[PDB]
């Protein structure tokens, strides 16, 4: 999940350096930070959305 700021147009991401054997492809979709909980946490107190 790469963060896009407010009213930001260009989103540069960077996978650093790696062997790319058995790579299948990409699939991407823009989300919302309000609609996406920070998973990995047991409780997100800044997630006011249901």
């Amino acid at each position: 999940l790469y963060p896009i700021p407010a009213n930001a147009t260009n989103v540069p991401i960077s996978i650093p350096s790696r062997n790319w054997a058995a790579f299948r492809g990409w699939a991407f979709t823009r989300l919302k930070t309000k609609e996406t909980p920070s998973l990995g946490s047991g409780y997100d107190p800044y997630y006011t959305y249901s």
Partner: protein, 50 residues
């Protein structure tokens, strides 16, 4: 001993490695490095630290 122990070329003792890709979670953070050991150099990993 004089010869065949220590080189005469320009070569650093201690190197500094920048994190090539840092990934920061709310509970952890990941630091990925390029530990480049050049030609005719050996690195004991006991000397490596963060």
């Amino acid at each position: 001993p004089t010869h065949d122990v220590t080189t005469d070329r320009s070569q650093r003792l201690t190197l500094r490695f920048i994190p090539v890709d840092r990934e920061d979670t709310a509970y952890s953070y990941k630091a990925r490095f390029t530990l480049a050991v050049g030609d005719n150099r050996v690195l004991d990993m006991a000397s490596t630290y963060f």
